[PDB]
Design a protein around this ligand. Sequence first.
Ligand SMILES: Cc1cc2nc3c(=O)[nH]c(=O)nc-3n(C[C@H](O)[C@H](O)[C@H](O)COP(=O)(O)OP(=O)(O)OC[C@H]3O[C@@H](n4cnc5c(N)ncnc54)[C@H](O)[C@@H]3O)c2cc1C
Length: 458
Amino acid sequence: GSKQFDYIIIGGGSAGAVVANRLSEDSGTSVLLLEAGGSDASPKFNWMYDVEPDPSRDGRVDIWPAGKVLGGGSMFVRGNAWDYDLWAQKGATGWDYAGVLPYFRKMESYALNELTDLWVKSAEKIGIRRNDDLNGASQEGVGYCDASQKDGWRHSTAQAYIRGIKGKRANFTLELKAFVERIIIEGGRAVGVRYSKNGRGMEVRARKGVVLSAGAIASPKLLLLSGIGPAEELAQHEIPMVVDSPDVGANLQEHPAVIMSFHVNKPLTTGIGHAQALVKTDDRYAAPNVQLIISPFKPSVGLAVGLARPESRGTVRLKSADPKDKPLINYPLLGEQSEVDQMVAGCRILRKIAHAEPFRDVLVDERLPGAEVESDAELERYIRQFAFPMYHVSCSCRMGSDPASVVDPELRVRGVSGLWVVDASVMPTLPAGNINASAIMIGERGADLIKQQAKTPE
Ligand SMILES: Cc1cc2nc3c(=O)[nH]c(=O)nc-3n(C[C@H](O)[C@H](O)[C@H](O)COP(=O)(O)OP(=O)(O)OC[C@H]3O[C@@H](n4cnc5c(N)ncnc54)[C@H](O)[C@@H]3O)c2cc1C
């Protein structure tokens, strides 16, 4: 621990790069950023986290990619106010829509066709209202993704936050290929970090504290390895318990989606195309529950049915006490029958749209699901077999006001001083969209919160 910094930030992804940039704005604040990856898929720049067999999909085992690269890789932020107001309703005081909107604006400050038209026209004919200003800060209805909306902003990538400081700020230091193994906690306070680099074990110290920005998979894992988590989990791996925190690694959420495809005469994995439709499958829903997307590039058109807000929940646990082991991840992509019902209902809407004029006037044949797949049970079969995750993993280190939450609304880990979690893991619920922008926004507001806490004693 010969080296001492004011703050140590674990993880240089979307949120962590923002925190590093913003906290080092103060000349007298030294900042160290530790990133397991390098600068500038494959194991070199992808974690390739294995997921346990999924009973909702006959034990199917998926591989979740996650950025292992400074900043990231693989824009516009149409804030859905229902999602952030839901956060505040679940205890994230100050993180309501009115609370995050200034930080989406700060992000904007920092940043300094015929087939799609045909699809949107067909949606309107079937009765899907066109999205416009009267909707407010919802994207309910059908609209074009590549457009500027009154409820949307512009933002930058995390690589823009790092480019402005790397080798330019004396109070900022960066260690790549640094695999953080444990947070060091002494006297109820996070005082440093142990990591390995180049085959050697290192330790470094923090004067003011540690910021855990490792993302929704690695952050809960790091908390567990540091003794912060459910007592049952910690004892099993004989990790001394520092904080009994019941929800570390709980509340894991991901977006499921499935592709429909049609040939015509005249990717979608992450869920952005030329046009989208946030629609309600029933009127019993308070917010649009299904997202329909079209990204039209023998020749075919690609459509997607995504579930805006998952009902299933997963877990992140340890495989062992060995820090280099990957986490144990459980997530039933379709664990609730209603999730399938909504996605089947989504598939039927996409059919109505394609069969309605004028898009029907360019239709040829349904290609991927199959025209013969018509019964609810036949569509459920197709969904269970071809559904996929959109890589929007979040919510594993829930912020809230209840004493069971992992962090309070100021992002402090309950039970420990000088320790924050600032990344997508703190989300109480997965928003319907703009995940990466939401994570950047969390870094923006989290940096302000940490700066505020530094003005006053803990
Ligand atoms: C392949 C892919 C494509 C995506 N596409 C989209 C898209 O089109 N649109 C969208 O809105 N969202 C997309 N997302 C989601 C978005 O990238 C994430 O929601 C967002 O990056 C989360 O930010 P984060 O800071 O929480 O975590 P991350 O961005 O994952 O940052 C965490 C960082 O911590 C590092 N780290 C982890 N463990 C350690 C450790 N032990 N020691 C040191 N460093 C460590 C990781 O290497 C990483 O750099 C995509 C995600 C993936 C994986």
